[PDB]
Design a protein around this nucleic acid. Structure first.
Ligand code: DCP
Ligand code: CA
Ligand code: K
Length: 430
DNA sequence: ATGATGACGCT
DNA sequence: AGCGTCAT
């Protein structure tokens, strides 16, 4: 009752760019706008692997991981943009720079946690308090929320999608207690107003559209963001959680999409996130461990405490290349040449990073994969990163991997290498 | 033969 | 430290 925390103390938003890499290419090439189109890498193998898909192309069934030759059978007029290739490998610089454009806009409104190249969490609790003091009990107009969905509404006693959206919004705003500055529903609503303003600023200053979720924590904000895409935002209130979770497959919740969520399903014999409420904390901790059990117990009630971390920059800068099947590297010279290619791209990104962000990496992680392993990485070893020099980093990487070579012959590499990865880590201010 | 990333938990 | 999970 009066002491049972409800997880309603924060306003958290997740902003996610719609078909991000596609929008980057469509901004650059107007011929691609408003068309079925996809972003591919490496044109030689089956037209390239698709890594991003516009919503027009999704209507034909085009998905990520499709080969472009196969996608073209689903969508013969599919337009494609290729990822840049430099030093024999895909180069994602254009998308990292576009990401920076968005992240810097988002940071004008609140401190962000960069979750990915195209997603950031925002803690809006303080901005909402300030905006509420500026409103002075004044009601919130539906015109301030022109692209907001209220999850779970409309409800109770028009057949077009926007009509539904407005009906639900009207019901929400009619119900709102705007005199209570500490109503969590009011705080979420003001949050949504700010997120409308943030999304409009992103679109105005970059051309990119995004979606967003507004709730009381990161998991609900992420789930909310995906409920109405593209170019929309969804408010998921605490009160909407029981109905929303009652038919929500467990794998949809962030961190349950893999083996842990599969084990929750198998071990407990359930399907939906709401079904977790019937277990005690101790039961869940017995099955999934102390941290996971506590987290599931709170999460299935809509409660989560993972804070929005103040981090706008990536913590690592990595360069990786696969060498599949027949192309696996079998000669020592092949391994040195590719390590140098990776090291040169890494040097260039690190130098840029040190000029922009006043920091230097201090550790070099080298990871390889050998032909035969099912694991994505077969061996990871670190050394000191003391100079931003590609020839030195590639030499050191080779030094810490060269004893993996099973071969008796010096010039050969066995087993051949199917993946090389160089990662700069452990940044220090400078 | 998806591939190229990136964060964080466990021991 | 090195390995694994989960994600974009
Ligand atoms: N397995 C993946 C997932 C994503 N990406 C890249 C390309 C995507 O454009 C971008 C963002 O990924 P999302 O999962 O957010 O997907 P999109 O932004 O493409 O689409 P959506 O509108 O569904 O978010 O990251 C990638 O290279 N490989
Ligand atoms: Ca996205
Ligand atoms: K994303």
């Amino acid at each position: 009752g009066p002491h049972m925390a409800t997880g309603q103390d924060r306003v958290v938003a997740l902003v996610d760019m719609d078909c991000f890499f596609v929008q980057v290419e469509q901004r650059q090439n107007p011929h691609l706008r408003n068309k079925p189109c996809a972003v591919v890498q490496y044109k030689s193998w089956k037209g390239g692997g698709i890594i991003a898909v516009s919503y027009e192309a999704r209507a034909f069934g085009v998905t990520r991981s499709m080969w472009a030759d196969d996608a073209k059978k689903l969508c013969p007029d599919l337009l494609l943009a290729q990822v840049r290739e430099s030093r024999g490998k895909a180069n994602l610089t254009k998308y990292r720079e576009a990401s920076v454009e968005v992240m810097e806009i988002m940071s004008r409104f609140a401190v962000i946690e960069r979750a990915s190249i195209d997603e950031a969490y925002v803690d809006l609790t303080s901005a909402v308090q300030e905006r509420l003091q500026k409103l002075q009990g004044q009601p919130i107009s539906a015109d301030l929320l022109p692209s907001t969905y209220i999850e779970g509404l409309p409800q109770g006693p028009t057949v077009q999608k926007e009509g539904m959206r407005k009906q639900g919004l009207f019901q929400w705003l009619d119900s709102l207690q705007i005199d209570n500055l500490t109503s969590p529903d009011l705080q979420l609503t003001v949050g949504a107003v700010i997120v409308e303003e943030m999304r409009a600023a992103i679109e105005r200053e970059t051309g990119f559209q995004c979606s967003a979720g507004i709730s009381h924590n990161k998991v609900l904000a992420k789930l909310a963001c995906g409920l109405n895409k593209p170019n929309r935002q969804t408010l998921v209130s605490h009160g909407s959680v029981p109905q929303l979770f009652s038919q929500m497959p467990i794998r949809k919740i962030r961190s349950l999409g893999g083996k842990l969520g599969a084990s929750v399903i198998e071990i407990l014999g359930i399907e939906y996130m709401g079904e977790l409420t019937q277990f005690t904390e101790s039961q869940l901790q017995s099955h999934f461990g102390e941290k996971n059990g506590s987290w599931l117990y709170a999460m299935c009630r809509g409660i989560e405490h993972d804070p929005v971390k103040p981090r706008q920059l990536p913590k690592t800068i990595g360069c990786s290349k696969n060498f599949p099947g027949k192309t696996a590297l079998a000669t020592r010279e092949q391994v040195q040449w590719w390590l140098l290619q990776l090291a040169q791209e890494l040097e260039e990104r690190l130098t840029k990073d040190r000029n922009d962000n006043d920091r230097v990496a201090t550790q070099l992680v080298v990871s390889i994969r050998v032909q035969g392993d099912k694991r994505l990485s077969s061996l990871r070893r670190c050394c000191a990163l003391t100079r931003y020099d590609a020839h030195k980093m590639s030499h050191d990487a080779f030094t810490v991997i060269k004893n993996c070579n099973t071969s008796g012959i010096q010039t050969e590499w066995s087993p051949p290498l199917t993946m090389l990865f160089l990662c700069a880590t452990k940044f220090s201010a400078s």
